[PDB]
């Protein structure tokens, strides 16, 4: 489950370099100021700046990182997915029309006006659960993309991955 | 092959107000950010500013915040600079720059726009 | 801002010859993730500045190996190697560590004959 989450990190990161021409260092417009957790039950955060200018690019591939990772996993592992998707996005869903619905919740809400309009620099990301063992704390890992439209997709993508471990 | 095409010489009066263009060709207009450079006789090279052609986000230069206004237009691929309340201290040659990448260099320089203030 | 000095302000050079220019800063240009961003530009008479020398020591797309930079911190140097004519104009030294972003006065490169 940790790797899944890592293999996902590098997927993000590799897509964003690739499509978005994103890179370890590029000036970031958009800066992650604040990203805590209320209620954290062994997770540990930390915040990755993969940052570019083309927001379109970065939230297209912030999905064909997540729809890859997604299909990659096994049937039986596979259909954990639709049930924790309810938990974060409140939308029912099935095994087949999740990849879909996600892309659907993601392009219709990182084109609203209030994030596309959004020029405040240093911006916070609050998820409100995380679970993790004892003995093994869940890595967190934000990537920053330099964007509100692009950060909206990777916070989206955030509450799905933070409900896997709960 | 990369071009920026800035627009031609301005005339203007003082306390009026003027907006230059510059159309980018040759690459993708909403990949790298779009800068902006003041050279007057007077002072040397002054940093305006830039601005994210995808995402319209702008940073500005403390000492222009009032002066100049940056846009830009993703339809005809061309980003725009207002200058506002001129007086004969704004007379320079103005550049529009493209950045590299990492948004740290200015690998592409436009031709200059020549603005002129005098009534 | 930060305070670019360039040091002369022109510099008269024959052919064949090797041509110094320094550029002293007033803070150091080291950031955060370790990066010196001081670059060295050139502009010719007309035209606009062309980018030679990007973080202190990497040439740019199509610059002849003859030119190369040095220094960190504060002081850095532009060494032109086998100056050609083709070569005058004048020098920017320039910094993107520290917004907002700076210039040198620049040194004019006199070729003498």
């Known amino acids: 489950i940790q790797t899944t989450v890592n293999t996902l990190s590098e997927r993000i990161s590799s897509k964003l370099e690739q499509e978005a021409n994103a890179s370890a260092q590029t000036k970031c417009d958009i800066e992650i100021g604040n990203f805590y957790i209320r209620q954290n039950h062994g997770c540990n955060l930390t915040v990755k700046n993969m940052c570019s200018a083309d927001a379109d690019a970065q939230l297209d591939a912030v999905l064909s990182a997540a729809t890859e990772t997604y299909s990659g996993l096994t049937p039986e592992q596979k259909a954990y997915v639709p049930a924790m998707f309810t938990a974060a996005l409140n939308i029912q869903t099935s095994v087949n029309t999740v990849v879909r619905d996600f892309e659907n919740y993601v392009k219709q809400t990182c084109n609203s006006s209030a994030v596309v309009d959004n020029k405040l620099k240093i911006q916070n990301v609050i998820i409100d659960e995380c679970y993790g063992a004892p003995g093994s704390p869940t890595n967190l890992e934000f990537i920053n993309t330099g964007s509100s439209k692009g950060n909206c997709a990777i916070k989206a993508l955030m509450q799905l991955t933070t409900k896997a471990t709960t | 092959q990369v071009q920026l095409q800035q627009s031609g010489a301005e005339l203007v009066k003082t306390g009026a107000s003027l907006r230059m263009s510059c159309k980018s060709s040759?690459?993708?207009?909403?990949?790298?950010?779009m800068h902006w450079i003041k050279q007057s006789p007077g002072q040397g090279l002054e940093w305006i500013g830039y601005?994210?052609?995808?995402?319209?986000?702008?940073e500005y230069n403390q000492k222009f915040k009032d002066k100049a206004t940056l846009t830009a237009d993703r339809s005809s691929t061309t980003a725009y600079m207002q200058l506002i309340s001129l007086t004969s201290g704004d007379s320079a040659v103005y550049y529009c720059?493209?950045?590299?990448?990492?948004?740290?260099?200015?690998?592409?320089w436009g031709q200059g726009t020549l603005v002129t203030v005098s009534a | 801002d930060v305070v670019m000095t360039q040091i002369p302000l022109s510099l008269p050079v024959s052919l064949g010859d090797q041509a110094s220019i320094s550029c002293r800063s007033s803070?150091?240009?080291?950031?955060?993730?370790?990066?010196?961003?001081l670059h060295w530009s050139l502009q010719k008479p007309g035209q606009s500045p062309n980018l030679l020398i990007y973080?202190?020591?990497n040439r740019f797309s199509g610059v002849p190996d003859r030119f190369s930079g040095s220094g960190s911190g504060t002081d850095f140097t532009l060494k032109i190697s086998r100056v050609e004519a083709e070569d005058l104009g004048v020098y920017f030294c320039?910094?993107?560590?520290?917004?907002?972003?700076?210039f040198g006065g620049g040194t004019k490169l006199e070729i003498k004959r």
């Open positions: 720059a493209r950045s590299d990448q990492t948004n740290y260099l200015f690998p592409y």
């Open positions: 040759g690459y993708t207009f909403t990949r790298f950010w």
């Open positions: 601005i994210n052609p995808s995402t319209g986000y702008t």
């Open positions: 803070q150091s240009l080291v950031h955060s993730n370790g990066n010196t961003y």
């Open positions: 973080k202190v020591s």
């Open positions: 320039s910094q993107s560590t520290h917004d907002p972003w700076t």
